[PDB]
Design a protein around this ligand. Structure first.
Ligand SMILES: [Mg+2]
Ligand SMILES: [Mg+2]
Ligand SMILES: [Mg+2]
Ligand SMILES: [Mg+2]
Ligand SMILES: [Mg+2]
Ligand SMILES: [Mg+2]
Ligand SMILES: [Mg+2]
Lengths: 151, 100, 79, 99, 114, 127, 206
RNA sequence: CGGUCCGGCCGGGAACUCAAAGGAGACUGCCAGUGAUAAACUGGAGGAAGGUGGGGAUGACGUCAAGUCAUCAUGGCCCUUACGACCAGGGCUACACACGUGCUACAAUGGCGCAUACAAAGAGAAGCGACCUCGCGAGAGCAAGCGGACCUCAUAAAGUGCGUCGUAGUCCGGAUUGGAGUCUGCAACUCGACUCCAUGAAGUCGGAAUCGCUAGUAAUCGUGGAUCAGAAUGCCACGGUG
């Protein structure tokens, strides 16, 4: 990425609802190249989340995503020996990508019986903004308002 | 390798075809037949009296020019170094630098 | 450890075990055969088994039958 | 009945040129000729260490391509059998006669 | 529940509950339930005293618990008094089977000390 | 006469035959559901029959050898589209846009000497 | 860095094999040692006879040795006098019957093996290496070579610190597979060690 | 298409998959924008492929008196009734420890049991060895085909379907050791691989620090090969999912 100015790989939509954002989500959860078992966990968590929150499977994801979606983040920059944290406005594409990544990482750190349950309860905590994932957007916010002078 | 280490292999081949090819094979198949002689054979004992070097398993595959006991290839009968040397001179038929 | 189809013993040592039974117990039997399985016809004898440099004399016992002669002659000095 | 010719050669532009000779000699002396049938090439690959001592990643990768050709002549005419038997073919091509 | 060697099996499935005895692994536990005419996917609940003693009589055939422990220890001491290589290593707390001692041999030696 | 189109992806090779009438799918003397245990692999073969309309308009006799689940399924997707152009040729425009005409040249990279895999390099040690 | 053998890399492209025979895994090793043993005999015997190349082909159960030489008269002898004594022992070494063919090397100053062997034989007569190299280069360029490169390595002229010296005239594109590059080695066994001669002759493209 | 033991299996058909020789094709060629009207870059059309399309082979003059006198070759030196040579046994496998490279883990994206869909590329006559039979098993006996697109190694595993375990040092994890064996080999004590029964360590995700990888890549899941009597978690290669 020094000289080469590349674009972004347009991935195929979801085989169930046809959502590109969900195709990003299944891949984020996916491990060891097991897409079959990855969508099986995402669909089982969506089936248990929409049922236990009042249908709208696309919208129940969107409510939990709006609370984890960050606006600003810090960028480590060494100017004069010292390392300065510069606050920078995140792009709409990465906004969702960071939001999805923290949902998966927080559900993995949970102690439930299954990943379909771990994901559902993390998506439930995010919908009401009171989980490990919303706190990762909170710590990112406190870091940005602090270094607000070096913007 | 050493001239003595090369000679030791010539002895190991000469004794491999003399006994363990036409005589010791006969007493080893006998020391396996369950149908005949289950206790009084002496074939296991008379196998010991035969020279040690006579066994085919006691032979080491060595580079047919240098005598190298390591990095041998049966296809050419030579070690990786002398294989490469002949390969580049086109002395090995149909052999060339492959890429896929 | 091996196939049940005959336990192994060296002919030069087996003939030395035979000669020691009929002519009576002598001094330690100097043998390098560490690969030979101990037979019941050995119990009571003193077989001097090699270790690489000296011959370790081992008094044969009934519980020693089935085991190799080289188990009772340490090969590596460790102190 | 039928005569089966199996050709083996490390060089390809030598096997089909010597095959062209067998097919033509047979069809000229009036015989039914099936093929030249191109059978799969056996690629015997070899990897040798290029350094006399140490240097594990430094290697030479070679192959021996063994080309295969099948020529089936249906009519065993005396004019064809004798024409094929007194044919001078490349010394680097092996010919297997199957009755 | 209480079978052969004083131990009190949990209220888990029959095959896993029987492995609790020292001398019965996965194979003996599958063969004991096949000989006594009991299912492997059934718990201790419903298994009456008439079904317990028939398994106790079945397991009594092979050396288990304290009886097996002394048998294992006897063969270890036998090698030790014999003076064999196999015995000299049970006496030195090092790998008997032939494994390397230059490095990784921590199960037998125990945890390291500088 | 039967409308033919060859399709391939990875080490999989699929042959597709088109005949009008019904919405039947026969893959290697088996049903569409019987062969593929995944619904994602079932939808990719249904993809050419979306832009170009079919519910019970035409039948397809298909056979595929080599590769795996997504490989075979991907190969069939390419075959149907090639058999579809064989039947009309004005369908090229709709088939380009969807990216089904293009043969996916992505093959597995060879293992290289000195490397653990195709690109995976063994762990480095400074001292 | 280290360079790829110019002959080896071009085998199949613009360069031919020295062994054309075919064999299965069964006798491939047995034939290869028989080839080494026959070349070894002939290089030792026909040393002063300017042997440039030796080609071995095995028609059925026979050996056909094609000796490429710049001096065919000395190799043949008095009406086949020398060919008969060679074939007789080639048949003995190989086991199968022998047939020796003699290929004339017209311009030997354009043959890598003969140029290299000439530098080697000169270094052993106590000639100055720089003169030997320049003479090899000049002779090759005046006879039509599109290019030449001659390299001599180790204890040059008896020196304690070994050097690697080279003379290059013309074009020598070692990266073009299409190019006809004739490459061969030779070793000069001097009173003060082994001196390695490497010669590259570019004859033209295609 | 004609005939069915429903097996391409037999007449046949040269259509197709494929096999392997020859040939076409992609060059910023076209269009548009940016740019000194240049070079080039960006985007688009067509196209199976687009800007060296993907991968490999190919490593300039030279640098580090960098590695190899133990592959071999070799100036000099040294031993030459010994630094040579033969043999048996032992050692290279020792074990207070330290570092580097790996494998296997710590589990429910998982363990186990049954059922089951889909590869690629290799190897083979002193060989691969089916089918059948015996043994829980490693194997063994008997014995076809095949020097091989025909026969054999050889059941791909991940995955999918159902059931079970339900956050537990556990139906996780397999070390270590006891008992009995199998095969190869003159011979498995030191010091082989594998099987069966029992044992069930540490480990519940790793401090400071640090490595690989930009796409069919990483991650994971099997498969084959060279060496090799036997002895792969190494190496070399192969496709699956991704
Ligand atoms: Mg020597
Ligand atoms: Mg050996
Ligand atoms: Mg237990
Ligand atoms: Mg082509
Ligand atoms: Mg280039
Ligand atoms: Mg140095
Ligand atoms: Mg387990």
């Amino acid at each position: 990425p020094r000289r080469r100015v590349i674009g972004q790989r347009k991935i195929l939509p979801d085989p169930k609802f046809g959502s590109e954002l969900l195709a990003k989500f299944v891949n984020i959860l996916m491990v060891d190249g097991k897409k079959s078992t990855a969508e099986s966990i995402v669909y089982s968590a969506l089936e248990t989340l929409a049922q236990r929150s009042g249908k709208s499977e696309l919208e129940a994801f969107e409510v939990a995503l709006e609370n984890v979606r960050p606006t600003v983040e810090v960028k480590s920059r060494r100017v004069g020996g010292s390392t300065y944290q510069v606050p920078v406005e995140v792009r709409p594409v990465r906004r969702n990508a960071l939001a999805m990544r923290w949902i998966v990482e927080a559900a993995r750190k949970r102690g439930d019986k299954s990943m379909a349950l771990r994901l559902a309860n993390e998506l439930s905590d995010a919908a009401e903004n009171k989980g490990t994932a919303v706190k990762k957007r909170e710590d990112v916010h406190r870091m940005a308002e602090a270094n607000k002078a070096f913007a | 390798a050493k001239q003595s280490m090369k000679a030791r292999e010539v002895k190991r081949v000469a004794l491999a075809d003399k006994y363990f090819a036409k005589r010791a094979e006969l007493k080893a198949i006998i020391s396996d037949v369950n149908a005949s002689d289950e206790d009084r054979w002496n074939a296991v004992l008379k196998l010991q009296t035969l020279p040690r070097d006579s066994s085919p398993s006691r032979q080491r595959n060595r580079c047919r020019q240098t005598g190298r006991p390591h990095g041998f290839l049966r296809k050419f009968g030579l070690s990786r170094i002398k294989v490469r040397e002949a390969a580049m001179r086109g002395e090995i038929p149909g052999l060339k630098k492959a890429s896929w | 450890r091996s196939l049940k189809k005959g336990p192994f013993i060296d002919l030069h040592l087996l003939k030395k075990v035979e000669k020691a039974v009929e002519s009576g117990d002598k001094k330690p039997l100097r043998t390098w055969s560490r690969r030979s399985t101990i037979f019941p016809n050995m119990i009571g004898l003193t077989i001097a088994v090699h270790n690489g440099r000296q011959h370790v004399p081992v008094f044969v016992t009934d519980e020693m039958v089935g085991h190799k002669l080289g188990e009772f002659a340490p090969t590596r000095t460790y102190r | 009945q039928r005569i089966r010719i199996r050709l083996k050669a490390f060089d390809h532009r030598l096997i089909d040129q010597a095959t062209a000779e067998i097919v033509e000699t047979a069809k000229r002396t009036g015989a039914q000729v099936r093929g030249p049938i191109p059978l799969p090439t056996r690629k015997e690959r070899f990897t040798v260490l290029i350094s006399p001592h140490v240097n594990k990643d430094a290697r030479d990768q070679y192959e021996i391509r063994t080309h295969l050709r099948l020529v089936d002549i249906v009519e065993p005419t005396e004019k064809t059998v004798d024409a094929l038997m007194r044919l001078d073919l490349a010394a680097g091509v092996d010919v297997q006669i199957s009755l | 529940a209480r079978i052969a060697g004083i131990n009190i099996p949990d209220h888990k499935h029959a095959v896993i509950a029987l492995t609790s005895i020292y001398g019965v692994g996965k194979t003996r536990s599958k063969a004991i339930l096949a000989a006594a005419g009991i299912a492997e996917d059934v718990k201790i609940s419903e298994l009456s005293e008439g079904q317990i003693d028939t398994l106790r009589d079945e397991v009594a055939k092979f050396v288990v618990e304290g009886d097996l422990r002394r048998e294992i220890s006897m063969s270890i001491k036998r090698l030790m008094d014999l003076g064999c290589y196999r015995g000299l290593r049970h006496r030195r707390g090092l790998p008997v089977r032939g494994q390397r001692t230059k490095t990784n041999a921590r199960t037998r030696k125990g945890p390291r000390k500088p | 006469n039967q409308y033919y189109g060859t399709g391939r992806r990875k080490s999989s090779a699929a042959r597709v035959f088109i005949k009008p009438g019904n919405g039947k799918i026969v893959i290697n003397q088996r049903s569409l559901e019987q062969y593929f245990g995944r619904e994602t692999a079932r939808m990719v073969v249904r993809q050419p029959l979306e832009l170009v309309d079919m519910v019970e308009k035409l039948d397809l006799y298909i056979t595929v050898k080599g590769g795996g689940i997504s490989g075979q399924a991907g190969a069939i997707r390419h075959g149907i589209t090639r058999a579809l152009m064989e039947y009309d040729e004005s369908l090229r425009s709709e088939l380009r846009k969807a990216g089904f005409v293009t043969r996916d040249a992505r093959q597995v990279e060879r293992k290289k000497v000195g490397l653990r895999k195709a690109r995976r390099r063994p762990q480095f040690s400074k001292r | 860095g280290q360079k790829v053998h110019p002959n080896g890399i071009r085998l199949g492209i613009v360069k031919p094999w020295n062994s054309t025979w075919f064999a299965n895994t069964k006798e491939f090793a047995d034939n290869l040692d028989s080839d080494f043993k026959v070349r070894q005999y002939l290089t030792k015997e026909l040393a002063k006879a300017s042997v440039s190349r030796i080609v071995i082909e095995r028609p059925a159960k026979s050996i056909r040795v094609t000796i490429h030489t710049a001096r065919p008269g000395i190799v043949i002898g008095k009406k086949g006098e020398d060919v008969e004594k060679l074939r007789k022992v080639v048949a003995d070494i190989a086991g199968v019957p022998a047939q020796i063919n003699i290929a004339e090397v017209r311009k030997p100053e354009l043959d890598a093996k003969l140029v290299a062997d000439s530098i080697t034989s000169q270094l052993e007569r106590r000639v100055m290496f720089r003169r030997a190299m320049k003479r090899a280069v000049q002779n090759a360029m005046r006879l039509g070579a599109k290019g030449i490169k001659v390299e001599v390595s180790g204890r040059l002229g008896g020196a304690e610190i070994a050097r690697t010296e080279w003379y290059r005239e013309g074009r020598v594109p070692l990266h073009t597979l299409r190019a006809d590059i004739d490459y061969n080695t030779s070793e000069a066994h001097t009173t003060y060690g082994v001196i390695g001669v490497k010669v590259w002759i570019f004859k033209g493209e295609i």
